[PDB]
């Protein structure tokens, strides 16, 4: 008795992590007196940012 | 939280035709590479020099340099003329509130357009509202400076009316600045309360760059206030 099956809403399957893989970043702080300029910060916070 | 002060050194300098100048420039705190220098004639508005302490304005002579980093930054004149006989400012773009300093005296040995509202006068005690009329750029595009000279004094940064239409105050006047633009008739406005003598003052108009030093400027407003 073929009726089809329910498939309206795609199923999905993720890493263990969730999120999956990722790249470094520097941070970075802006420039008050500049509408664009930025500068590092390598102050309290890591330079091997995910 | 920590004012950006700079002290210029010496204050006059007496000079002859074809001679070599230098002036020298102590900043309160680090500002790293990034400080402006200026040459201004006594009515008109700036005009700029040097930016990120070595690199030159276009248009900008030959003759002038500058050099420094950190606190100290330098500003020569290789052999100078009698153009160059007007009155130098030092200048930070590093952080806001924007800075320049004192201002010193050089004096001889024995497209984009600003135009602003008329001169006028009015009694302490008041309000006053003046104008900057824009044209060859967009105000979303660039932020709106307001500076004035008090007579024979320093140059003081009143605010910025940034791209976003984001406001940013010299909190040191206790907030008496209000700027505003319109967006339809591009202009943009500044509106000061609670005026005293120690206002009376040339009001200037400016705009920075992609993001270097103030460049293109109004013609002044002359705002009077006697008691």
């Known amino acids: 008795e073929n009726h089809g099956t329910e498939d309206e809403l795609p199923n999905y399957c993720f890493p263990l992590g969730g999120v999956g893989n990722n790249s470094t970043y520097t941070k970075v702080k802006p420039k008050t007196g500049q509408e664009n300029g930025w500068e590092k910060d390598a102050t309290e916070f890591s330079d091997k940012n995910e | 939280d920590k004012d950006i002060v700079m002290t210029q050194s010496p204050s006059s300098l007496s000079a002859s035709v074809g001679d070599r100048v230098t002036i020298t420039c102590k900043a309160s705190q680090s500002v790293t590479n990034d400080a402006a220098w200026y040459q201004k004639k006594p009515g008109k508005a700036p005009k700029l020099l040097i930016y990120?302490?070595?690199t030159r304005y276009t248009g900008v002579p030959s003759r002038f340099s500058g050099s420094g980093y950190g606190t100290d930054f330098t500003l020569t004149i290789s052999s100078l003329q009698p153009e160059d006989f007007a009155t130098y400012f030092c200048?930070?773009?590093?952080?806001?509130?924007?800075?320049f300093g004192q201002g010193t005296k050089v004096e001889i040995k024995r497209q984009v357009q600003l135009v602003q509202s008329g001169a006028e006068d009015k009694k302490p005690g008041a309000s006053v509202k003046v104008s900057c009329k824009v044209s060859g750029f967009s105000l979303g595009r660039y932020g709106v400076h307001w500076v004035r000279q008090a007579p024979g004094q320093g140059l003081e940064w009143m605010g910025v009316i940034w791209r976003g239409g984001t406001t940013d105050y010299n909190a040191k006047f206790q907030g008496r600045v209000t700027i505003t633009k319109d967006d339809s008739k591009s202009t943009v406005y500044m509106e000061l309360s609670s005026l005293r003598s120690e206002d009376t003052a040339v009001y200037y108009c400016?705009?920075?760059?992609?993001?270097?030093?103030?460049?293109?400027w109004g013609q002044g407003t002359l705002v009077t206030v006697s008691s």
């Open positions: 400016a705009r920075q760059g992609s993001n270097f030093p103030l460049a293109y």
């Open positions: 200048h930070q773009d590093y952080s806001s509130p924007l800075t």
């Open positions: 990120q302490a070595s």
